[PDB]
Design a protein around this ligand. Structure first.
Ligand code: NA
Length: 121
């Protein structure tokens, strides 16, 4: 059906916008602290602590499968990256501080993305 096609084209355009958002967020992490999963071979107890690990590579895989149906889903995954880091790492660490800074800087990017998704439909 043509209605199915139109929904597919909308998902594709959202995916395109979310790619640009993901690139912009990742630019705010030049140290690449959040680029890849935590290795369970190097914080071996990680999964006793953190139930839903998340990272930018994992988000990118979901995005390339058009796996985010709306901006809220994408934001939830970004917030997991931040939130997991602020739980596992103490307030005095470079990791926790990097999460705070990414949150602050990412807020700006996400604020405009919400306006563009609403505005374009
Ligand atoms: Na903590």
């Amino acid at each position: 059906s043509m209605e199915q096609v139109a929904m597919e084209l909308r998902l594709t355009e959202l995916t395109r916008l979310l790619r640009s958002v993901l690139d912009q967020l990742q630019d705010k992490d030049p140290a690449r602290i959040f680029a890849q999963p935590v290795s369970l071979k190097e914080v071996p107890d990680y999964l006793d602590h953190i139930k839903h690990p998340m990272d930018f590579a994992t988000m990118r895989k979901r995005l390339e499968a058009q796996g985010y149906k709306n901006l809220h889903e994408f934001e939830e995954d970004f917030d997991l990256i931040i939130d997991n880091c602020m739980k596992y790492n103490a307030r005095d660490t470079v990791f926790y501080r990097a999460a705070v800074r990414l949150r602050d800087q990412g807020g700006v990017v996400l604020r405009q993305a919400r306006r563009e998704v609403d505005s374009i439909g």
